[PDB]
Write a protein that binds this ligand. Structure first.
Ligand SMILES: [Zn+2]
Ligand SMILES: [Zn+2]
Ligand SMILES: [Zn+2]
Ligand SMILES: [Zn+2]
Ligand SMILES: [Zn+2]
Ligand SMILES: [Zn+2]
Ligand SMILES: [Zn+2]
Ligand SMILES: [Zn+2]
Ligand SMILES: [Zn+2]
Ligand SMILES: [Zn+2]
Length: 191
């Protein structure tokens, strides 16, 4: 099938397991991804990047389009869901989703309140791909294939500042990330 995505230990990513998503570029490239809030629309929570490269953020879990495939592979539509350790600030879902166009900034933001499964027109905004980013990590790509007769955006995901926070949005140059096992996943390779 398609080539598996690898984590920072060299292990193939497993669907249903927790991974931190951490910038492959540290320093001013920042740390990991997490749920954030906008003052003007506190729910759903938005996707933000921690500024500290020592802060891995909140892990995500990946859900394959083909639920029978245990491995997360490049160029395959999947759903992405934050699994917060903390209490719920919002009752919307923590599944990533592309927002409606933001006229005040010109951006298509990554936000949450996405849906898991049910591939097709209704869930089009909830399907992401992971692609290789040259020789350094992986980039997220919004280019869903789940609806043949749907017109869709087809763009890499970059990072962009907004209102003092680092957000993710569609762009020309995708930002590179690596995947680090969370503690729950480390248990899956040890007896
Ligand atoms: Zn292929
Ligand atoms: Zn190995
Ligand atoms: Zn392996
Ligand atoms: Zn922090
Ligand atoms: Zn299969
Ligand atoms: Zn919205
Ligand atoms: Zn706006
Ligand atoms: Zn603004
Ligand atoms: Zn704003
Ligand atoms: Zn186990």
């Amino acid at each position: 099938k398609n080539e598996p995505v690898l984590d920072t230990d060299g292990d193939e990513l497993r669907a249903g397991e927790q991974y931190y998503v951490v910038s492959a570029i540290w320093g001013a490239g920042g740390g990991g991804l997490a749920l954030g809030r906008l003052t003007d629309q506190k729910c759903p929570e938005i996707v933000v990047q921690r500024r500290s490269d020592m802060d891995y953020g909140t892990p995500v879990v990946f859900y394959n389009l083909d639920t029978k495939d245990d491995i997360v592979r490049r160029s395959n539509d999947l759903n992405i869901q934050f699994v917060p350790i903390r209490d719920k600030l919002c009752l919307t879902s923590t599944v990533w989703k592309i927002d409606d166009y933001d006229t005040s900034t010109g951006k298509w933001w990554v936000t949450t309140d996405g849906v898991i499964g049910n591939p097709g027109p209704q869930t089009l905004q909830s399907w992401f791909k992971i692609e290789k980013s040259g020789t350094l990590g992986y980039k997220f790509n919004f280019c869903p294939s789940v609806c043949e007769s749907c017109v869709t955006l087809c763009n890499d995901i970059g990072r962009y500042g907004h209102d003092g926070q680092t957000r993710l949005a569609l762009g020309e140059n995708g930002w590179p990330f690596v995947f680090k096992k969370a503690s729950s996943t480390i248990k899956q390779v040890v007896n």
